[PDB]
């Protein structure tokens, strides 16, 4: 999954990454980061100018650069790091979400 949470409205824009993405690949972690960045960019594009963010906050330290690269089209949107080891890694601990993740036959 790519857990993308709006903390104002509670809109979890959950992109489900499928097993078919990782087929016959290498340098996998790096690839994943890039993929995530791409997804984020797509999401941003989808959102209209009123609903678009200001600060896209990132949980991990090394998700900045790729995101930045992908978000050169949207320079108004800043990309923010954080000292907080936020608990959004426990999105899969939530049941319904987990179920949804399990039951996916495509990128969704």
């Amino acid at each position: 999954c790519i857990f993308t949470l709006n903390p104002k409205t509670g809109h979890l824009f959950l992109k489900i990454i499928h097993t078919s993405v990782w087929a016959g690949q290498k340098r996998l972690s790096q690839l994943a980061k890039w993929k995530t960045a791409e997804e984020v960019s797509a999401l941003v594009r989808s959102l209209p100018k009123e609903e678009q963010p200001k600060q896209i906050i990132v949980t991990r330290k090394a998700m900045l650069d790729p995101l930045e690269v992908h978000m050169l089209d949207f320079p108004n949107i800043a990309i923010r790091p954080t000292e907080l080891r936020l608990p959004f890694s426990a999105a899969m601990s939530i049941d319904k979400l987990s179920d949804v993740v399990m039951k996916a036959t495509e990128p969704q």
């Binding site: 790096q30 690839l31 890039w34 650069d65 790729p66 992908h70 050169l72």
Partner: protein
């Protein structure tokens, strides 16, 4: 018949040439653009260049 994609690494220019079928070319162009914006390897290269130049 085919196509020769080409990416000038030192100028970051890209272009391709060859044979095309209906609806392909725009898509291809888009893909190329995407790659230029963000391919991991290309990004790495850019970073390296920056480092070299400071």
């Amino acid at each position: 018949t085919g196509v020769m994609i080409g990416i000038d690494l030192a100028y970051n220019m890209y272009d391709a040439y060859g044979n095309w079928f209906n609806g392909l070319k725009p898509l291809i162009q888009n893909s190329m653009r995407t790659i230029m914006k963000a391919n991991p390897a290309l990004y790495v290269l850019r970073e390296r260049i920056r480092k070299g130049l400071q």
